[PDB]
Amino acid sequence: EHLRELRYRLIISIIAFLIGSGIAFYFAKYVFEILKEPILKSYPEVELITLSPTEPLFILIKISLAVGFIIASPVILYQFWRFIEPALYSHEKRAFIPLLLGSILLFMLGALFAYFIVLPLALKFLLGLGFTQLLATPYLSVDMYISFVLKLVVAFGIAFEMPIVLYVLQKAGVITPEQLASFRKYFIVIAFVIGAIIAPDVSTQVLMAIPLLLLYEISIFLGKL
Ligand SMILES: CCCCCCCCCCC(CCCCCCCCCC)(CO[C@H]1O[C@@H](CO)[C@H](O[C@@H]2O[C@@H](CO)[C@H](O)[C@@H](O)[C@@H]2O)[C@@H](O)[C@@H]1O)CO[C@H]1O[C@@H](CO)[C@H](O[C@@H]2O[C@@H](CO)[C@H](O)[C@@H](O)[C@@H]2O)[C@@H](O)[C@H]1O
Fold first, then answer.
1. Which of 106, 98, 22, 115 is nearest to 67 (CA)?
2. Which residues have C-beta within 8 Å of that of residue 68, sequence separation ≥ 6?
3. How far apart are CA 23 and CA 68, in angstroms?
4. Which of its termini does the chain have fewer beta carbons within 10 Å around, N or C?
5. Ligand 1 atom 9: the closest Cα is on which residue?
6. Which of 219, 220, 223 is nearest to 106 (CA)?
7. Which atom of ligand 1 lies at the shortest distance from residue 30's CA?
């Protein structure tokens, strides 16, 4: 049953993600505008050329897949939450509703944080560091810039879900707040690994690790037992 439940809830979540991805595909040219907007306004001297051969569809498929996941985030959050509580951990179903709503708005606040705080900051640390206008002119590849935005935006959505899945595991006594306090020296490496994968330089790898450790230290404080 628990074996089969996942092998059906997965297919429902995967079915939702593709419906969401297809929607994202249709209005992708407009989503490409929202993404281009942060650079276009801050450093207009920086040209977004397509250094790539004939790959504006790869940029499309990346856009249709990442944005298709932010559309499906409410369905995916539900399939997680229903497979765990009241299913295994909690007991009340009107503790589940404020949990789903709370976790739906934590993925949205995560994406807004990346797009409106991490990213503009990540651009000043990259090309806004004084007179670096010479090494940044038709030097920007759109496939580079778009991807970094999509990585940063999706990672922060997910990174924000940590203090709820954690508070709920700590409450269900699956983990203790001291067990997170012991994993600190490993999450510092986790955060810098994630920061190495998604960020282009050290300045941005660090810029990313900071809110991640901060989200980890929010989970320990939600060690109210
Ligand atoms: C969960 C479902 C998914 C929801 C999110 C998906 C993405 C939604 C963004 C898409 C969308 C609304 C779509 C709504 C329908 C959703 C239905 C969902 C599926 C249901 C099953 C944004 O909608 C608006 O959003 C705001 C921008 O953020 C703005 O609104 C207000 O505006 C101010 C006005 O005065 C207000 O004063 C201000 O207050 C707000 O700024 C508008 O600028 C914008 O149109 C449409 O935008 C774009 O669509 C594309 C066609 O692909 C259009 O194609 C191009 O346009 C031609 C023009 O000639 C070009 O010639 C041609 O190149 C091409 O043809 C674009 O033109 C474009 O307009």
1. 22
2. 17, 18, 20, 21, 22, 23, 24, 25
3. 7
4. N
5. 27
6. 219
7. 48
The domain containing residue 197 runs over which residues? 1-225
Of residues 11, 22, 122, 123, the one with CA closest to residue 65: 22
* Nearest partner of 159 among 110, 118, 114, 204, judged by Cα: 110
d(CA 154, CA 147): 10
Q: What is the DSSP string of 28-70?
A: HHHHHHHHHHHHHHH-TTS-EE--SSS-HHHHHHHHHHHHHHH
Q: Which two tokens stand for residue 10?
A: 């997965």
Residue type, 21: S
Number of domains in the chain: 1
* Residue 71 in contact with ligand 1 by CB distance below 6 A: yes
- Give distance in angstroms: CA of 30 to centre of ligand 1: 7
Paired residues of 140 in beta bridges: 48
Please spell the DSSP secondary structure of 124-153, one letter per residue.
HTTT-SSS-SSSSSTTEEHHHHHHHHHHHH
Residue 22 Cβ < 6 Å to ligand 1: no
